[PDB]
Amino acid sequence: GVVDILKGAAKDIAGHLASKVM
């Protein structure tokens, strides 16, 4: 599934941003 990738690459970023506020 190609979407699965795009869905990860995108959220893969929110992970780092979450660390900043966390």
Q: CA–CA distance from 8 to each of 2, 4 (Å)?
A: 10, 6
Q: Under 8 Å CB-to-CB from 18, ≥6 apart: which residues? A: none
Residue with tokens 């690459």: 9
Token pair, residue 6, equals: 């795009």
Scanning 1-22, the segments in alpha helix (DSSP H) are 2-21
Residue with tokens 């979450």: 18
* C-alpha to C-alpha distance for 8 and 1, rounded to whole angstroms: 11
* C-alpha to C-alpha distance for 4 and 2, rounded to whole angstroms: 5
**Method underlying the structure:** NMR
* C-alpha to C-alpha distance for 7 and 21, rounded to whole angstroms: 22
Token pair, residue 13, equals: 């970023």
Token pair, residue 7, equals: 């869905």
Exposed e or buried b per residue across 1-22, where buried means at least 16 C-beta atoms within 10 angstroms of its C-beta: eeeeeeeeeeeeeeeeeeeeee
